[PDB]
Amino acid sequence: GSLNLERDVQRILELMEHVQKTGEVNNAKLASLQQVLQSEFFGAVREVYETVY
Amino acid sequence: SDAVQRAKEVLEEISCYPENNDAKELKRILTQPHFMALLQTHDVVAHEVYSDEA
């Protein structure tokens, strides 16, 4: 009932961890993406976005 | 706006690593006018958090 992007925001961490199974993708950056993807600010800010929208 | 870039930045390295075009696309699609737009709307303060004392 919500944006798939938001839902995929979590499912993305799965694909990332799947592609990172190649080795040639320093999990450093891959993980770094998780810190932002799993960032709370995303929801905190996303909340405002919806409010304004 | 470099912190957010670090998110997709991983994709920059995946450019060499042949991964699932779908998976890699997930990180790409993760950059929309909603999310990536919010990052640039939040990174504003994040970057200001350390306002160059200069």
From Swiss-Prot, chain B:
Coiled coil: none annotated. Ubiquitous. Expression is significantly greater in brain relative to kidney, lung, and liver and in fetal brain and kidney relative to lung and liver. It comes from the Eukaryota. Signal peptide: none annotated. It is found in: Nucleus; Cytoplasm; Cell membrane. Residues 1-53 form the L27 domain. Multidomain scaffolding Mg(2+)-independent protein kinase that catalyzes the phosphotransfer from ATP to proteins such as NRXN1, and plays a role in synaptic transmembrane protein anchoring and ion channel trafficking. Contributes to neural development and regulation of gene expression via interaction with the transcription factor TBR1. Binds to cell-surface proteins, including amyloid precursor protein, neurexins and syndecans. May mediate a link between the extracellular matrix and the actin cytoskeleton via its interaction with syndecan and with the actin/spectrin-binding protein 4.1. The first L27 domain binds DLG1 and the second L27 domain probably binds LIN7. In the N-terminal section; belongs to the protein kinase superfamily. CAMK Ser/Thr protein kinase family. CaMK subfamily. Belongs to the MAGUK family. CASK and LIN7 form two mutually exclusive tripartite complexes with APBA1 or CASKIN1. Component of the brain-specific heterotrimeric complex (LIN-10-LIN-2-LIN-7 complex) composed of at least APBA1, CASK, and LIN7, which associates with the motor protein KIF17 to transport vesicles along microtubules. Forms a heterotrimeric complex with DLG1 and LIN7B via their L27 domains. Identified in a complex with ACTN4, IQGAP1, MAGI2, NPHS1, SPTAN1 and SPTBN1. Part of a complex containing CASK, TBR1 and TSPYL2. Interacts with WHRN. It is linked to Intellectual developmental disorder with microcephaly and pontine and cerebellar hypoplasia: A disorder characterized by significantly below average general intellectual functioning associated with impairments in adaptive behavior and manifested during the developmental period. Affected individuals can manifest a severe phenotype consisting of severe intellectual deficit, congenital or postnatal microcephaly, disproportionate brainstem and cerebellar hypoplasia. A milder phenotype consists of intellectual disability alone or associated with nystagmus. This is Peripheral plasma membrane protein CASK. It comes from Homo sapiens. The gene is CASK. The chain holds residues 403 to 456 of 926 of the full protein.
